[PDB]
Design a protein around this ligand. Structure first.
Ligand SMILES: C[C@H](O)CC(=O)SCCNC(=O)CCNC(=O)[C@H](O)C(C)(C)COP(=O)(O)OP(=O)(O)OC[C@H]1O[C@@H](n2cnc3c(N)ncnc32)[C@H](O)[C@@H]1OP(=O)(O)O
Ligand SMILES: C[C@H](O)CC(=O)SCCNC(=O)CCNC(=O)[C@H](O)C(C)(C)COP(=O)(O)OP(=O)(O)OC[C@H]1O[C@@H](n2cnc3c(N)ncnc32)[C@H](O)[C@@H]1OP(=O)(O)O
Lengths: 248, 304, 248, 304
């Protein structure tokens, strides 16, 4: 149960934290249409976070999505390092979104075959949304990569800047492996082929290069984060920290 | 003597025949609607900013999700209004630029800061409540594309306004600190919400023509009075007060009589000198300028 | 006592909030020498905040500098709007610093003649530091304003962007006036001549223009802030909010 | 046969006659000191970033002020070390650029993230404690400008290290949550602090010449052993533990024997592949590039 709880929480945390980053874009996008699109994606991801976190609380036998989101510190958060990266320019945001949506598609496709019914059901809802997200992010990868000289350069740089964090997408620990052998979780190492098939093709189509740097950054799943997470949590949790134990 | 075109138009208006984009219309009618629908669409856009200010800080995931859905809808409503304005022969890109330059207005209410989470529920409740009274009144505006866009918009907005009230109800029934938060947000937003309806009927240069052309179906003062009569019972339901020493029920007239609006403040705000005017326009100018390479990328990709 | 407490707290809050902004620059300056200088200024201002806040707590008969700094929300904070402005580029930071140091010099010069001994003593320490700050900020105004075309433009823009907040420097309320008539406080309206003599000359010397916009923004002293303060306080107070009532 | 210049130099070193900037020195001696003093100065600069990360979040105004004073001192120490390095004929601007390009190193310890306030007290205590052992040992380094800069630096640093320990003592004597914070910070910083002393005496390419030229007065392992012997009693004073199952007192030798360092991690880190390497250099590169117009302004003003 402890393993299943932690696994579920990781997936919830990935979506929660990325949703937070997308929320910062509200009113700041290059076009009203993009503002609409980012709010929509952030809303889907928030919905997924609520689903995973709710199940995590139910598994643990205490708390709820709000105790989980607002009363854990950065050392207890278990999101991927990729989703806590700063928004940066629009290409930095597109790169991060594309890497994640490609992964979500690969993951949720297989997780809807989980032998855990609730995880399977949550995943069956999330995959429909992840497919929308991937069309949007891949569409923008192509438009920026194969746009102007300027946009092509920014998109390459965005990709290069984020690459080292992709290692964690296929990192497996004992929780992953144990649950995967029970047919409950997906072993993230087995997601590489599908993610690379999508992402390599997408970058190529955009007229860009796959970075040659070997990806090496992990630790988010173990509560070992970059220096970006603490400040995100200060902002996210402030009100709950000031006025704890209330209804809103 | 009116021309036959002019006379026919007045007859169409009198018989409540909706004006469509291909119909003749007085040039002053075309222009006042480009003005009003364009600034209505500008308001949707700017209004994302005070609410967006709290998306990352909302106290629960439920309230955060509700707020994201609202803001996403506001964006969609801006799009509907730009489409409607474009049927009159204007260009979205052009009127948006006039907004950036301070050559066109957006709603006064969006120049006020969100200083607490209660401000968000109060915007959902009072501010959206005022926009609903005004916007439902425009479902019978004489220009068809505008009327039909109001119908669609009003169907969506009133749901969000109900959610705003429920967020305020949670504070009203919560701890003493939450109740004080709500009251303080009301104290700061009450009069600015009243100002959303526009200047008094004595000080409203566009009303003469707008009323005659059935663009405006109720006077600024009429709509504001209805809002006060409808909203005061909602304030009471929350166990809250109104920052107005002169507010009282007048059994003689069957209305709540309320105090004088600060028109000096109103005029400061609509002319760029309110609390957040500079910040709101800086933010949209920054988004436009920094997004330029993105728009140029999309254009260059389309052509290939 | 209530008036004196609030007046003292305003001065403390001005220094605390500006100190917070300067702290963000640490490690990010154009030169190691500038990093040194900004940390130094931020440290002086923090020292002043501790002095004013400590006296404010003593006047109120409860709490201390930490309860004041970490347990008040944005509606209770009473700093000038000018000191909560974002750092922006280096000119934005120099403009804000220069306007404030010029004001501090004018104010503390006169406040060391206060009929309140503790306020007089706090001011006698602060004026020595404010004089250092003014040399630094004015020196950089001149170097940027009268540097390159590029730097000259950025410095003008920085000045223009901040101007509207200078109105609050000479705004007097009933607390100011009542305490000033007792010879305890300085009536801020009477600071204008000295501040304008300094600032007008400095801008001219830098080969820049005094903005023609009439300054119109106030409210910080009444707890009516820009949207910048809330997020600053979330960051500043997080740990204290999470783990209240402890010793550190 | 050594040349007379070479022989005279070896005789100066043996008699502990400090080498000064105008003295002849082997070219390899000049260069290893430009390397070591330059990277020492780089370390001062980069080390401002993990601590700066917490300046705006420190839990009390007292702890915030102490931390600001420390960081201000680090900047000053960087300046002293650049001055000292420049006496050898190098240019600060040039070696700083090599640091930005990853062509020169800075201390491994600064590639680790500050994930809690306890990390700050632990950096003040363990990390500064390790730098103090190493830096006091360099007060008798053979090159005069370097030795004298170490004297000045050590006089200032040991005060800040004492303040770091006191911040850790507050957590150690505080609530259960504060105690757990301290332990977790120790668990994450203990081994990285041990690595500050450098590789084992068997794997240290610069040691042969540095020891012979009395640049290095104690071996990496000797200094690390002294640090462990001195620090373990401080851990005990805090009522804390060391994340080392093999640490034990050996009465036979009179030393604490401790476990094996992860040299694979060490080598990853010093070669740019640690936890924050990319972030640290991005931050300094961003500061340099974005500050360019400021430096060009200062230069153009000076000339007028
Ligand atoms: C996104 C939000 O939900 C949008 C809302 O629904 S807010 C609720 C009010 N509704 C709207 O703003 C949209 C539809 N617009 C209207 O109904 C009308 O334009 C109005 C009632 C706001 C003003 O009436 P109108 O006859 O156009 O102007 P008038 O009464 O003569 O006022 C004089 C000037 O002040 C402007 N004004 C009036 N009230 C204003 C306000 N609250 N904020 C900003 N400007 C205002 C008018 O547009 C006009 O200036 P202009 O000629 O440069 O446009
Ligand atoms: C700002 C901080 O307070 C600075 C500190 O005081 S940290 C404490 C350690 N002291 C210093 O870093 C400053 C003075 N320097 C030294 O004493 C020595 O350079 C040292 C002990 C770090 C390394 O010894 P040295 O003989 O120079 O190198 P050696 O033992 O052969 O190590 C092999 C390589 O790894 C580097 N290295 C060793 N330890 C390192 C570490 N902890 N971090 C980064 N690089 C390290 C060496 O510099 C060398 O590489 P290079 O030839 O490219 O410079």
């Amino acid at each position: 149960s402890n393993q299943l709880t932690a696994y579920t929480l990781r997936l919830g945390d990935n979506c929660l934290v990325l949703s937070q980053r997308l929320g910062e874009w509200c009113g700041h996008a290059p076009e009203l249409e993009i503002d609409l699109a980012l709010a929509n994606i952030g809303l889907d991801l928030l919905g997924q976070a609520r689903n995973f976190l709710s199940y995590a609380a139910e598994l643990a036998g205490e708390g709820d999505e709000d105790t989980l989101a607002f009363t854990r510190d950065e050392r207890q958060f278990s999101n991927l390092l990729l989703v806590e990266q700063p928004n940066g320019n629009f290409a930095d945001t597109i790169a991060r979104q594309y890497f994640i949506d490609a992964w979500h598609v690969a993951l949720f496709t297989r997780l809807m075959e989980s032998r855990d019914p609730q995880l399977a059901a949550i995943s069956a809802k999330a995959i429909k949304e992840a497919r929308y997200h991937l069309r949007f992010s891949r569409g923008w990868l192509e438009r920026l990569g194969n746009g102007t000289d300027v946009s092509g350069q920014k998109m390459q740089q965005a990709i290069n800047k984020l690459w080292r964090f992709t290692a964690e997408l296929f990192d497996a620990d004992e929780i992953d492996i144990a649950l995967s052998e029970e047919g409950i979780a997906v072993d993230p190492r087995t997601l590489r082929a599908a993610w690379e098939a999508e992402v390599f093709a997408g970058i190529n189509e955009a007229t860009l290069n796959v970075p040659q740097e070997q990806a090496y950054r992990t630790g988010g799943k173990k509560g070992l984060h970059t220096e970006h997470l603490g400040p995100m949590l200060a902002e996210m949790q402030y009100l709950q920290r000031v006025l704890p134990g209330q209804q809103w | 003597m009116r021309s036959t075109q002019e006379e026919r138009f007045e007859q169409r208006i009198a018989q409540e025949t909706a004006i469509e984009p291909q119909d003749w219309m007085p040039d002053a009618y075309r222009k006042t609607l480009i003005r009003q629908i364009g600034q209505h669409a500008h308001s949707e856009i700017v209004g994302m900013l005070p609410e967006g200010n709290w998306i990352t800080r909302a106290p629960t995931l439920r309230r955060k999700a509700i707020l994201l859905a609202k803001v996403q809808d506001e964006a969609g409503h801006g799009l509907y209004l730009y489409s409607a304005a474009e049927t009159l022969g204007c260009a979205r890109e052009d009127i948006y630029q006039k907004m950036l330059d301070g050559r066109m207005k957006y709603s006064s209410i969006f120049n006020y800061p969100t200083l607490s989470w209660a401000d968000i529920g109060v915007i959902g409740w009072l501010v959206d409540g005022a926009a609903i009274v005004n916007q439902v009144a425009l479902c019978r505006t004489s220009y068809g594309p505008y009327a039909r866009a109001m119908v669609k918009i009003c169907k969506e907005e009133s749901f969000h306004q109900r959610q705003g009230f429920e967020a305020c109800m949670a504070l009203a029934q919560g701890s003493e600190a939450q109740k004080q938060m709500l009251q303080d947000a009301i104290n700061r937003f009450w009069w600015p919400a009243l100002m959303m309806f526009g200047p008094n009927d004595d000080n409203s240069p566009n009303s003469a023509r707008s009323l005659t052309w059935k663009i405006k179906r109720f006077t600024n003062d009429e709509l504001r009075q209805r809002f006060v009569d409808n909203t005061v019972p909602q304030v009471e339901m929350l166990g809250m007060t109104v920052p107005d020493p002169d507010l009282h029920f007048d059994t003689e007239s069957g209305h709540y009589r309320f105090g004088e609006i600060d028109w000096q403040e109103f005029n400061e705000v609509i002319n760029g000198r309110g609390i957040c005017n500079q910040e709101r326009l800086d933010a949209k100018r920054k988004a436009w300028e920094e997004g330029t390479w993105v728009r140029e990328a999309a254009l260059a990709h389309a052509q290939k």
